[PDB]
Amino acid sequence: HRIRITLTSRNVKSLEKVCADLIRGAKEKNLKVKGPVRMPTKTLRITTRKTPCGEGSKTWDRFQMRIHKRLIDLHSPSEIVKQITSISIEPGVEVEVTIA
């Protein structure tokens, strides 16, 4: 019964819209649902060079990259949860369903 759905996304507002839609769908389908547990983000800094040759002043790049993580805890049979996850998918949010 203990379902730990992990939602991974790079964008913030699309992930917030998806998890809010899942919470508002659980309220319509009348099941017990926990709030959005906001796990901390991750950062990836990349420092490279600009010039192909080794001449002139030394440049240093700053490439940033972020990724987030949310989770929705559920106490429901899986037949209800599959009907929820089949509806309204987008390529931004990646869903990981775990039942334990």
Partner 1 sequence: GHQQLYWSHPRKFGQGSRSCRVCSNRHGLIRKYGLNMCRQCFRQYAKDIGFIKLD
Partner 2 sequence: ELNEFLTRELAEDGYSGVEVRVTPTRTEIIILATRTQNVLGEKGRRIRELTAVVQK
Residues that bind partner 1 (CB under 8 A): 10, 46, 48-50, 52, 61-65
Q: Which does 56 bind (CB under 5 to 8 A by kind): RNA, partner 2, partner 1, none?
A: RNA
Q: How far is the CB of 71 from partner 1 (least distance, A)?
A: 23
Q: Which residues pair with 42 in a beta bridge?
A: 67
Between 13-28 and 78-86, two packed helices, what is the crossing angle to 10 degrees? 130
Distance from chain centroid for Cα 54: 41
Q: Which of residues 81-100 bind partner 2 (CB under 8 A)?
A: 89-91
Q: Which of residues 30-89 bind RNA (CB under 7 A)?
A: 39-40, 42-45, 47-57, 59-60, 62, 69
C-beta neighbour count of 24 within 10 angstroms: 11
| Interaction site with RNA (CB under 7 A) | 39-40, 42-45, 47-57, 59-60, 62, 69
